[PDB]
Symmetry: C5
Amino acid sequence: SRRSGYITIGYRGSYTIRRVARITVCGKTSLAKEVFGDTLNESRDPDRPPERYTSRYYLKFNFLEQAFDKLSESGFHMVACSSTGTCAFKIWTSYTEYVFCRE
Amino acid sequence: SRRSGYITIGYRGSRRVARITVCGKTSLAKEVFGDTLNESRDPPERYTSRYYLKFNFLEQAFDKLSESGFHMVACSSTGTCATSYTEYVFCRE
Amino acid sequence: SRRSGYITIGYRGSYRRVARITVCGKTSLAKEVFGDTLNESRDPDRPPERYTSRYYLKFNFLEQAFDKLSESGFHMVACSSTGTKIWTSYTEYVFCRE
Amino acid sequence: RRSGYITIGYRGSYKFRRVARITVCGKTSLAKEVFGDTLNESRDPDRPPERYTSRYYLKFNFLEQAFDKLSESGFHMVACSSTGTCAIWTSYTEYVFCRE
Amino acid sequence: SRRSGYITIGYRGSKFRRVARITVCGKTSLAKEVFGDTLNESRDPDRPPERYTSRYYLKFNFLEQAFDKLSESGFHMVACSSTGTTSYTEYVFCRE
């Protein structure tokens, strides 16, 4: 409870009438670092103080469930999930986010 | 974590978090967010759907709800191509 | 519990603008929860054990409906939304009292 | 009582909800336990108890009546999702139930 | 628990429901423990248990049969999302 809070995992996918390019991490930087350690890629947002938030971290691996398993090992649980679709000329893409919480 | 009710967190995206809206009992929202809350509407009603937050990190809003004993119980989003609107429902028992 | 059951709350939006909050479920549960804030005009004088999909509420704050459900011991167990210069949407929030 | 999942499907059309068919998917013995004679097996008849179906439906049209019967048999809603089909406007929503 | 983790079940969709292929994503040891011989590892074969995959799929067609097997191994459904224009729906399962 002293280090409670939220981490959101994001994933951009595409379907043609799973393939991963980048798993994004949003939340307080100290929490994301505790959970993911050196798998965290902070290049898009470097050198932030621990009590600041980020929406631009991402992970050095490409399996979604691999991110979820690490969150579970740190006592975070999935509490929500949403997805939004898009149509294009055929390919259709979507961004999915998975909200995790530690009590 | 004293008096029960719902607070809904919303934002419209294209992540770029333009503005985080707060809906619910006005007294509950002020308990949770204090001066991070700009009301921006002129007397106040018991319920609002037009409060919004000064900061732009969604998880920072979620974390403050957690500190007051609110839990996320649902979320939904809708989009049409030309953006999207996402909503997160919190509840304190 | 003997008075257990589901109530679904819905509303049509456009892009928050809430025109009307709909209420679906067994009528006696809806009446227990919302009392005089319930508008039964589109399905009046129903027996307490029959189901309706046509009640709505006389207020337009969604969280006020959620708060009343909580006061009667109902909890939100699911949520879904369907989308389409203005696009409309329907969102429903499923509540359950066990 | 044996564990399992039952999914409830609802073809909707769009303030009120469009009265339509409520479909039931899962192991047939579970669906029959839950719904009894409100279950319509005419599109998948004479199935053995341990086989699965995705073609049962209910003889009433109120979704919450189906949710209530699931609750009476100890099933709980664990997920839901809908698909928007723009063309009025029709959507399909499914509600996943689980008895552990 | 020692063998805790996530398995995500997917189906590409378009009496109504028609499901062709049920995809399985997660750690390969977990997918194998849950699904055994019903699992199709041909698309991603010769994989060590501690590695992850997004290319397994199931030999049967009933989504609830996949859900029931997950339950039998102590996995629970924690989230669900769908997107479409045809549709793709995924069900996230977790064993603590």
